[PDB]
Amino acid sequence: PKLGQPVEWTPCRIPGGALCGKLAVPVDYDRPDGDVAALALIRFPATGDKIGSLVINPGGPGESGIEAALGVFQTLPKRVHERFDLVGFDPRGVASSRPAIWCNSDADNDRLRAEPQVDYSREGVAHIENETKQFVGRCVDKMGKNFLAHVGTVNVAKDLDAIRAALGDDKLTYLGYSYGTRIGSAYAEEFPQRVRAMILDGAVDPNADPIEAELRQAKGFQDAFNNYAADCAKNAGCPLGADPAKAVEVYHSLVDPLVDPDNPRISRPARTKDPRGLSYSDAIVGTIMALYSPNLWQHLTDGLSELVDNRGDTLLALADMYMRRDSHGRYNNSGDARVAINCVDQPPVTDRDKVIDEDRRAREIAPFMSYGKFTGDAPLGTCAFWPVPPTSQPHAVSAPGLVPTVVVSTTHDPATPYKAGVDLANQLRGSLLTFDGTQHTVVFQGDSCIDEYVTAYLIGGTTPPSGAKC
């Protein structure tokens, strides 16, 4: 694409008369005459009287907005389809946008997933951190330091305003999920006068401490695990047993044997038709994936029943869904993009004592996710080694002129807990719409109570009353 040139739309190669095109944006907005990024867009034209475009972001970070728009199209309320062009976009560095963040080969990822990743002795910590340093080196080798430095949400928000103008909208109508609510609040702060409407489903509090938010997310997934297990306990054949007070214990009786009990570095994978088998780390990841929605609880139950017989096929497939590894062993770039974006969106945690204390607390908060006992050591995260500095700093959202917005928060959301949505709505001086459930996000996913509130807000600007629940 040509910087400043309008989007050339062409039929995508797909539901509707979907149109696809690219938009050029500067890599560095302070160097407009420099390197350029090409953002991939998809557009489903409105069927009635068009108000404008409804631009979505599915979250992640690292998740394709084009893929999400294709999914949302199938569950879009008729009224929204009539009045809005549904538009998805791949953020800079993500999926079909170019250049795309790449760090790991398919083999790099496969080799890491084969490891139990439970050894937190000094030797185990050293091994993890060495792997992490080699990962970062690969990101730098394949991507520019310059491109890595500018993939953050602060620049995504600027890209979003360019997208708004390229779509012909005077003002933005935006729906953001999870991480996408950070795009939303960043956009709201820099372009408050351009915001027509914003729905933010699954909230990120930009003023949160990174460690406490991580521990609240650990608690969220343990809460979800507990709700899954109490449900399972009522059902015949529950692989975690009929006593939910012992479900964590029984769970570990199923996954812990995937680790050599005398050498925590040795995997004893459960048998699968796939040549990989099921490692302990993939078992945990596959469990986390299933706790995103009750619609995946049946799959977790199938996966744990398989583990009773030392089989791991379903948990492996759940982990592959989390990692976005397709049936040919190919990963999309969501994993690498997620890290690179997260590491520039706030100052990383580099203090060893804080990281060690975090692991001590996480083991108690989310025992389903921890193997063995606290060792007194824990590895630094990937961002502690990141080679370019943060481009955003934690702070409370301040956008006093912003139109009323709607934050949707699910009471037992494991990934973006409920209270984070309460806090974000407070900072935005917006409306809080509550959904009672144990899932991450809910908008345009089959609930007419939620969707009716959202439709009325998008079309007529009507916000839900204080205390609205679905």
Ligand SMILES: CCCCCCCCCCCCCCCC(=O)O
């Ligand atoms: C999304 C896949 C890539 C993960 C980031 C690359 C760093 C690989 C080395 C870390 C090994 C994983 C063990 C530590 C993970 C954690 O701290 O929770």
